[PDB]
Amino acid sequence: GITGTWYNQLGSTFIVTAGADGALTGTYESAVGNAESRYVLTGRYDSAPATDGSGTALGWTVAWKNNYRNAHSATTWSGQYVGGAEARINTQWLLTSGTTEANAWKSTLVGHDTFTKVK
Amino acid sequence: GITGTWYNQLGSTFIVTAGADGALTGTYESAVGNAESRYVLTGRYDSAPATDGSGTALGWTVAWKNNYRNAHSATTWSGQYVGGAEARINTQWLLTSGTTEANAWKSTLVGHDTFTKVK
Amino acid sequence: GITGTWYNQLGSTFIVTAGADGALTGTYESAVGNAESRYVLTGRYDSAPATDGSGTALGWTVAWKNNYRNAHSATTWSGQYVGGAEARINTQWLLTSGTTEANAWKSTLVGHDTFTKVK
Amino acid sequence: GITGTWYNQLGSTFIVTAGADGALTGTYESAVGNAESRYVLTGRYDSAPATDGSGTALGWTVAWKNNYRNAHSATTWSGQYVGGAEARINTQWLLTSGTTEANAWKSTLVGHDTFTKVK
Amino acid sequence: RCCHPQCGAVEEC
Amino acid sequence: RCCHPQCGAVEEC
Amino acid sequence: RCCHPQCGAVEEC
Amino acid sequence: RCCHPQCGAVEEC
Numbered sequence: 001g002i003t004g005t006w007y008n009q010l011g012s013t014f015i016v017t018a019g020a021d022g023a024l025t026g027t028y029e030s031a032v033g034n035a036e037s038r039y040v041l042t043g044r045y046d047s048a049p050a051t052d053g054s055g056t057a058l059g060w061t062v063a064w065k066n067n068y069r070n071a072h073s074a075t076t077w078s079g080q081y082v083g084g085a086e087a088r089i090n091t092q093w094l095l096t097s098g099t100t101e102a103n104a105w106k107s108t109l110v111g112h113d114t115f116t117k118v119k
Numbered sequence: 120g121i122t123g124t125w126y127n128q129l130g131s132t133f134i135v136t137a138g139a140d141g142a143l144t145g146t147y148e149s150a151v152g153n154a155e156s157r158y159v160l161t162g163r164y165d166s167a168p169a170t171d172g173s174g175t176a177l178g179w180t181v182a183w184k185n186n187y188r189n190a191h192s193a194t195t196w197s198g199q200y201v202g203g204a205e206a207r208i209n210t211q212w213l214l215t216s217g218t219t220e221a222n223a224w225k226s227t228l229v230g231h232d233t234f235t236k237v238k
Numbered sequence: 239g240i241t242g243t244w245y246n247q248l249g250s251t252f253i254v255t256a257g258a259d260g261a262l263t264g265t266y267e268s269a270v271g272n273a274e275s276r277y278v279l280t281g282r283y284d285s286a287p288a289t290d291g292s293g294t295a296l297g298w299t300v301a302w303k304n305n306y307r308n309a310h311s312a313t314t315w316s317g318q319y320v321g322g323a324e325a326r327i328n329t330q331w332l333l334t335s336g337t338t339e340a341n342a343w344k345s346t347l348v349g350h351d352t353f354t355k356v357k
Numbered sequence: 358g359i360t361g362t363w364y365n366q367l368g369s370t371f372i373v374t375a376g377a378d379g380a381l382t383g384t385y386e387s388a389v390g391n392a393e394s395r396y397v398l399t400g401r402y403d404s405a406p407a408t409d410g411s412g413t414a415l416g417w418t419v420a421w422k423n424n425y426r427n428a429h430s431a432t433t434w435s436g437q438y439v440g441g442a443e444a445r446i447n448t449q450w451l452l453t454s455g456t457t458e459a460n461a462w463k464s465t466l467v468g469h470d471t472f473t474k475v476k
Numbered sequence: 477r478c479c480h481p482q483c484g485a486v487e488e489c
Numbered sequence: 490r491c492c493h494p495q496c497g498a499v500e501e502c
Numbered sequence: 503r504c505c506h507p508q509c510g511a512v513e514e515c
Numbered sequence: 516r517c518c519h520p521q522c523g524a525v526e527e528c
Contacts, residue, residue, distance in 0.1 A: 010462060011497030022182050023161065030499045037499055042142065042161045043195075044182035046217060050191050054217040055226075059195035061178035063141050063163035064494050069501060071493055072169050076162075076178035076195035078213035078227065082220075092213055092227055092348060094197035094467070095495060098165060098173040102516040105367060107174075107199065108211055110330060110451070110467040112350050129343060130510040149510045156512055183507045188514065190507055211467060213348070214508060221477040224248060229332070229348040229449060231469045249484035260420050261399065268486045275486060280380065280399045281433075282420035284455060288429050292455040293464075297433035299416035301379050301401035302481050307488070309480055310407050314400075314416035314433035316451035316465065320458075330465055332435035332449055333482060336403060336411040339439070340503040345412075346435065346449055368523035387523045394525055421520045426527065428520055452521060459490040 001083045002045060002056070006115035014041070014115055016060075022047040028062045036068040045081070055080030058089070073097040077113065089115040120202045121164060121175070125234035133160070133234055135179075141166040147181045155187040164200070174199030177208070192216040196232065208234040239321045240283060240294070244353035252279075252353055254298075260285040266300045274306040283319070293318030296327070311335040315351065327353040358440045359402060359413070363472035371398070371472055373417075379404040385419045393425040402438070412437030415446070430454040434470065446472040 002018040013033060016026035024043035043060025059078040064071035079091030095109040121137040132152065135145035143162035162179025178197040183190035198210030214228040240256040251271060254264035262281035281298025297316040302309035317329030333347040359375040370390065373383035381400035400417025416435040421428035436448030452466040479489035492502035505515035518528035 010495075012495075022159070022184060024180075028494075030494070030497050032499045034499065036501070037494065039494060040141070040163065042163060043180045044159065044161060044193060046182050046184050046189065046191055046193065048184065048189055049217050053219050054191065055219075055223070057182065057191055057193040057215050057217045059180035059182070059193040059213070059215065061162045061180060061195065061197075062494075063165050063176065063178070065141060065165050065167060069494075070165065070167055072165055072173065072176055073493075074163060074165065074176040074178040074197060075495060076180065076197040076213070078180075078193065078195040078215045080215055080217055080223075080226065090223065092215070092350070094178075094195070094211055094213060095463075096176050096178065096197045096199055096211075098168050098176040098199050100172050100174075101201070104174070104199075104209065105468055105522055106452070106466050106519070108197065108467050109463050110348070110465050111462055112330070129508070131508070149507075149512045151512050153512060156507060156510075158507060188507070192506075194508055211469070214344070221483075224349055224483050225333075225347050225480070227348050228344050229346050229467070230343055231449070248482075250482075260397070260422060262418075266481075268481070268484045270486050272486065274488075275481065277481060278379070278401065280401060281418045282397065282399060282431060284420050284422050284427065284429055284431065286422060286427055287455055291457050292429065293457075293461070295420065295429055295431040295453050295455045297418035297420070297431040297451075297453065299400045299418055299433065299435075300481075301403050301414065301416070303379060303403050303405065307481075308403065308405055310403055310411065310414055311480075312401060312403065312414040312416040312435060313482060314418065314435040314451070316418075316431065316433040316453045318453055318455055318461075318464065328461065330451055330453075332416070332433070332451060334414050334416065334435045334437055334449075336406050336414040336437050338410050338412075342412070342437075342447065343509055344506070345437065367521075369521070387520075387525050389525050391525060393527075394520060394523075396520060426520070430519075432521055459496075462496050463493070 001087060002081050004117065006089060006117065007119050008113045008115050018045060020047065024058065024060050039064060039066050055082045087117055120206060121200050123236065125208060125236060126238050127232045127234050135160070137164060139166065143177065143179050158183060158185050174201045206236055239325060240319050242355065244327060244355065245357050246351045246353050256283060258285065262296065262298050277302060277304050293320045325355055358444060359438050361474065363446060363474060364476050365470040365472050375402060377404065381415065381417050396421060396423050412439045444474055
């Protein structure tokens with residue numbers, strides 16, 4: 001149920017493939033999806049989740065660098081996939097920028113994203 | 120400078136290889152390193168960091184399931200690598216457990232780990 | 239615009255008074271609001287926000303103990319108030335439980351709440 | 358055990374008084390203590406913690422505005438007090454800045470501070 | 477379900 | 490408005 | 503004491 | 516170096 005295209009509320013598109021071994025691979029891109037806005041993503045997920053109705057734990061990372069741009073930062077999303085007619089992936093994320101020692105205290109932003117199968 | 124064995128304060132060992140493309144692959148294990156406590160990790164890092172003395176942004180994920188155990192959860196670490204005689208990887212992490220709808224509010228733990236090359 | 243009664247999506251009620259000095263005082267209670275479910279809250283807010291359309295930064299704390307129950311924990315909400323016809327307070331929170339040294343690593347939960355003037 | 362002067366690693370001083378009712382009141386200032394860098398803080402703590410060796414849950418807020426300056430932001434610290442010859446307050450914090458709708462996604466920074474009774 | 481004040485608990489568990 | 494890939498940036502700033 | 507993989511658990515609880 | 520009250524700023528930037 002995880003493999004496929006996902007959309008968040010900001011205007012980003014998450015294209016992912018869930019491997020049978022628990023691997024997550026794909027790309028993260030803008031609404032348009034042009035070459036310069038495409039970034040590689042890799043992650044892991046619980047390939048054998050509980051059957052008590054609980055969600056499927058997962059997480060992935062995107063380093064904001066590709067062959068055209070580099071924002072010297074990386075974001076990690078941690079959350080869970082909830083299946084159903086209105087499937088969704090609920091996450092909380094951490095965006096860390098490369099900083100000098102003096103600015104390390106303010107190197108990490110925290111937020112939350114909800115991804116759906118429909119725009 | 121990232122490839123190698125890292126240790127945190129909790130007694131965990133992080134063995135990673137930093138690819139030229141920006142990929143991070145490796146294993147996260149207990150101090151003892153027994154097979155039952157070894158988990159796969161995958162992540163990304165900035166392969167072309169700034170040269171102004173800033174750290175190198177990175178992140179990785181570990182789904183807590185292997186061929187022996189499954190904790191139905193996943194942790195993502197977001198932070199930066201700082202080189203030098205006393206190199207370190209400073210991170211903040213998010214541990215999300217698979218939960219029911221009713222327990223989703225308390226599904227995510229947050230913390231911080233500092234990894235060093237020496238125990 | 240902050241003084242008054244606010245509701246979140248979990249069924250909790252936030253009754254607050256915003257002082258001219260930047261103080262926030264009030265009570266946090268369940269949908270019902272019985273005595274045993276009422277807790278004291280205190281916080282601070284920017285009493286002179288920017289006039290460029292930015293939100294008003296604020297934060298508050300609730301220690302989960304009253305004259306009837308004690309959950310040995312405390313939650314802090316950090317966020318901003320956005321005025322308008324559909325005013326709201328968007329927050330991210332940290333819930334820390336008192337723990338032994340051995341369980342300190344998993345003492346803090348992270349989440350997010352959105353409060354509105356209408357149920 | 359909480360009342361008194363505390364110091365973090367960045368170079369900030371936390372002066373607090375723990376009331377019998379679970380209230381925390383005080384000031385947060387720079388190492389120098391000049392009037393322009395002094396800000397009011399208010400919070401709450403568990404006034405009847407467990408007796409099993411667990412820490413004391415607490416939290417406080419500081420809106421970054423005083424009679425001299427205003428940074429249009431607020432920080433909340435959530436953590437626990439651990440008594441002993443080496444007393445400490447271990448916390449994680451959230452710093453939210455007042456932002457426009459468009460910048461709301463990056464309005465909150467996350468970090469961690471450890472306060473001690475000695476510099 | 478909810479047994480903590482945060483999730484809006486009304487009665488004790 | 491958005492100048493970081495995270496907020497869905499298309500144009501570089 | 504540790505019963506979760508992250509705190510370096512070696513054995514199961 | 517520090518321009519925010521939280522990192523212990525003494526002067527204004």
